[PDB]
Amino acid sequence: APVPVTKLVCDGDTYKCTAYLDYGDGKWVAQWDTAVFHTT
Amino acid sequence: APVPVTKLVCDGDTYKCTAYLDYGDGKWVAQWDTAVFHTT
Amino acid sequence: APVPVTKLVCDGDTYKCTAYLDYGDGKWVAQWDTAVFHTT
Ligand SMILES: CC(=O)N[C@@H]1[C@@H](O)[C@H](O[C@@H]2O[C@H](CO)[C@@H](O)[C@H](O)[C@H]2NC(C)=O)[C@@H](CO[C@@H]2O[C@@H](C)[C@@H](O)[C@@H](O)[C@@H]2O)O[C@H]1O
Ligand SMILES: CC(=O)N[C@@H]1[C@@H](O)[C@H](O[C@@H]2O[C@H](CO)[C@@H](O)[C@H](O)[C@H]2NC(C)=O)[C@@H](CO[C@@H]2O[C@@H](C)[C@@H](O)[C@@H](O)[C@@H]2O)O[C@H]1O
Ligand SMILES: CC(=O)N[C@@H]1[C@@H](O)[C@H](O[C@@H]2O[C@H](CO)[C@@H](O)[C@H](O)[C@H]2NC(C)=O)[C@@H](CO[C@@H]2O[C@@H](C)[C@@H](O)[C@@H](O)[C@@H]2O)O[C@H]1O
């Protein structure tokens, strides 16, 4: 079932975003692969 | 065109995040595949 | 290093979600492919 995200962080060394979830014992995360780049 | 996300939720049964969007009639969502796991 | 997401926007022409990152000059983003659709 859907649960809120407590915070989003991204890492430009590992190219992953991590969502810390409000669920259960508090130690669950969602993680996915991302492009990370500088824009103009 | 990029539109704000009003709400982000993640679901460890379907392994999807859903972003609720601020656009038009208010019923648009984004959805992507994610890993969901416990940490120590 | 993990850095916080300032804000999240999604685009239903490019089918990309963009996370604006709190880092350096403020022009860094994380981007990933997404479904975008209308709900009922
Ligand atoms: C002078 C300096 O340190 N400039 C920074 C860049 O090094 C850095 O780019 C990353 O550099 C590492 C080290 O070689 C590479 O392995 C990465 O692939 C580079 N990442 C990208 C996306 O180009 C950039 C970006 O910083 C990275 O991403 C940020 C969002 C943040 O997570 C940082 O912690 C991370 O190092 O920053 C320049 O200022
Ligand atoms: C006893 C109990 O209900 N324990 C929970 C686990 O079942 C659950 O892990 C999921 O279990 C389902 C069905 O048993 C598996 O098909 C899934 O693959 C499991 N998901 C994961 C990520 O391992 C966990 C996690 O709960 C899930 O993810 C949460 C973030 C939330 O979205 C839940 O609604 C979702 O069911 O929780 C245990 O406590
Ligand atoms: C009359 C009108 O302009 N209606 C809008 C639709 O055009 C639009 O659906 C997109 O339509 C383009 C071509 O017009 C297609 O190539 C895309 O595949 C369609 N996208 C989707 C997801 O169906 C919709 C949705 O608008 C898009 O996504 C939004 C969330 C936002 O990012 C918009 O800037 C973007 O155009 O909106 C109708 O009103």
TrEMBL record, chains A, B, C:
Bridged cysteine pairs (disulfide): 10-17
Organism the protein comes from: Pholiota squarrosa
Protein name, UniProt field: Lectin (PhoSL)
Top-rank lineage group of the source organism: Eukaryota
